[PDB]
Write an enzyme that holds these catalytic residues in place. Structure first.
Site, PDB file in Angstrom:
ATOM      1  N   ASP A  80       0.782  -1.077  -0.073  1.00  0.00           N
ATOM      2  CA  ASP A  80       0.080   0.055   0.014  1.00  0.00           C
ATOM      3  C   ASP A  80       0.826   1.235  -0.064  1.00  0.00           C
ATOM      4  O   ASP A  80       1.913   1.176   0.100  1.00  0.00           O
ATOM      5  CB  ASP A  80      -0.720   0.079   1.331  1.00  0.00           C
ATOM      6  CG  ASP A  80      -2.162   0.665   1.033  1.00  0.00           C
ATOM      7  OD1 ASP A  80      -2.924   0.756   2.025  1.00  0.00           O
ATOM      8  OD2 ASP A  80      -2.471   1.222  -0.069  1.00  0.00           O
TER       9      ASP A  80
ATOM     10  N   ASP B  58       1.866   4.383   2.213  1.00  0.00           N
ATOM     11  CA  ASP B  58       2.005   4.855   3.317  1.00  0.00           C
ATOM     12  C   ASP B  58       0.774   6.101   3.866  1.00  0.00           C
ATOM     13  O   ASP B  58       0.342   6.413   2.737  1.00  0.00           O
ATOM     14  CB  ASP B  58       3.302   5.256   3.799  1.00  0.00           C
ATOM     15  CG  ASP B  58       3.599   5.155   5.519  1.00  0.00           C
ATOM     16  OD1 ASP B  58       3.385   4.075   5.886  1.00  0.00           O
ATOM     17  OD2 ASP B  58       4.414   5.881   6.005  1.00  0.00           O
TER      18      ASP B  58
END
Lengths: 268, 263, 261
Positions: free
Chosen positions: B212, B214
């Site tokens: 992902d 951050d």
């Protein structure tokens, strides 16, 4: 009446610098120092020499007992502590061989005790918050600068030392990043040495010797040559600087350091 | 005679990647590795697989025995250590699911021994100041990079990994701060694994998988990433085994030995 | 139903704050908190006061047992922890005496355990990665902001705190570099206090009181800050009591549980 602690780092582990030298081992409430204190003199001035890494250079920067070292110097009645440190340069204009009389620091250490007042010693009771706006004694720095000018040494009048945990060197990313933080030179030993010196009420100053550029910048033999030359530069700088120190009044300065050091302690 | 150590992180705690699997606990001067070593082969290449967090993912990153993990792999006779790491992206162009064959790092860990040369082990005497100007093996990285291309994998050729202590994630201020530092990706495990590998004279490379972005800007992507990482490994390792490593290994060991200051 | 944990920092080591003081020393699986929990009420809201450094201010920031403190407040039933911290200012616009309802932190600590889930306590099993995107409770921070206006206190609505290890103060070069990182105020106690409150599933907010400019640019303004903080707490806590929380705590409680592997 002055007494000069001298801490010798890389390239100055065991330097013949003191006349009338005596070897003295001590213990302190924080453990043993890196090696024997070397009692001795330069011209008329009483000195105490100590090998940061031990005289055979066997102690890595993370494992230096900085508490024991500064405490032993304090206890021996030292008024000043002048040290050397082999460092990397983070700036084009700070060339290998240059001296930097550092005025600031950036801490990147993680595993080192930074205070005498840890609540575990009865020789250091309470919680101390020592001021660090001006970590280095400006008069001692002024004399170091003036004297290197005399000696014709390439010297920078200020600079910020970033101190890393080590023992590894920086990565390239870190070297570049340190630049953006405003650091000028890098090493593994200034912090917490300078911090403990303040707590102890001792005028502390550092002779930083640029042994090479750190890896940001676009040969072992060249580095060892630079390092040996640097050591000889530092040796004269001390030899000439220490008698100048012994010929001015310091009770003025020293009363203000002892006061800042007492006034940082909170009693229960 | 290469032998590839392989360290599985998040999503690769217990992969089934090796043929002729065998298993054994081992000891080192630095304590117990995270788990048993799994011995086996990929095509004709001997491999050692190790789960970084244990096969049940029970060990948090600040508690991982980095020293024993790398020393174990070294004593088993590994020439290479190829690792995976589940990371966050700090860069718009590093998209969830991308691989980054990182080439730098920034240290944000605070509690971890970073050297074998701590003055207290007979097997590592002296003070070692290991150079980190180039922390990963460029040659191992280059094969990873080429192999990712042949596999059609979204792969970045370089990147700086900031390794935080954890186990908490970064604040939003921190995430933005790391971007100002030049960090490209973020994780909890690269430092000190990488430093200890260089000290060991092992060629080290790291397949970092962005799960992902951050928080400056999970579970399913993570499963797809492990499968891309496993494919990269299966295809890269027979390439490493088919090329010559003696000079590379000789350069590494010499640099390492040269770093060590004796009494 | 709410219960407000209150941690008092410097200048608030033993404040005269609660209606009906009952002293309770506890133990936790992480050790003893800095001191006795003080149970009491403010306008019918159940409170629990605790001195971060102990009632006589004996414990340094590095040595505060943040795990024991958060855990004790949690076992006591707290839904909320509102704390005070005496800080330095890193901005011209944040003056001595101003309050800062901080919304972010930058961690510059080194020695401190920042999790319950360390693999060594059976009260906290597993590996936990707590999200820290929004470290402070927005709900609780708002109430504090409104009240501070209602009380006539100089008060900034957001701010990033840098938490250094201490006990020393920052050098100038550190203090300049924290500004460029985006810190606005500097202390020694926020981290891992904030972090542990999240794991615990408790609503956390912090009243930061700027006692001076940090050195990039006293005892009196501390005593005044103390007073301002007391007021802010005395007035803030009943507003919280008379609002609804079921959904917020549910979401906090759920994020905490889903962070454990």
């Amino acid at each position: 009446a002055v007494k000069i602690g001298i801490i010798g780092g890389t390239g100055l582990d065991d330097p013949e610098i003191l006349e009338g030298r005596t070897e003295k081992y001590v213990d302190t409430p924080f453990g043993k120092p890196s090696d024997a204190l070397i009692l001795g003199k330069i011209k008329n001035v009483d000195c105490v020499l100590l090998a940061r890494h031990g005289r055979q250079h066997t102690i890595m920067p993370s494992k230096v007992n900085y508490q024991a070292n500064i405490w032993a110097l304090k206890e021996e009645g030292c008024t000043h502590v002048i040290v050397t440190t082999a460092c990397g340069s983070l700036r084009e204009e700070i060339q290998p061989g240059d001296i930097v009389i550092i005025d600031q620091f950036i801490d990147r250490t993680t595993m080192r005790p930074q205070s005498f007042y840890d609540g575990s010693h009865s020789c250091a009771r309470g919680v101390c918050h020592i001021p660090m706006a001006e970590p280095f004694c400006p008069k001692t720095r002024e004399v170091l600068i003036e004297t290197a000018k005399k000696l014709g040494l390439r010297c920078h009048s200020k600079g910020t030392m970033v101190t890393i945990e080590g023992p590894r060197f920086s990565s390239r990313a870190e070297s570049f990043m340190f630049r953006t933080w405003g650091a000028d030179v890098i090493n593994m030993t200034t912090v917490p040495e300078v911090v403990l010196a303040k707590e102890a009420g001792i005028c502390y100053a550092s002779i930083a010797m640029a042994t090479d550029y750190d890896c940001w910048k676009e040969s072992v033999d060249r580095v060892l040559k630079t390092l040996k030359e640097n050591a000889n530069k530092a040796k004269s700088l001390l030899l000439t600087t220490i008698p100048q120190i012994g010929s001015t009044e310091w009770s003025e300065t020293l009363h203000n350091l002892k006061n800042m050091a007492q006034f940082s302690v909170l009693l229960p």
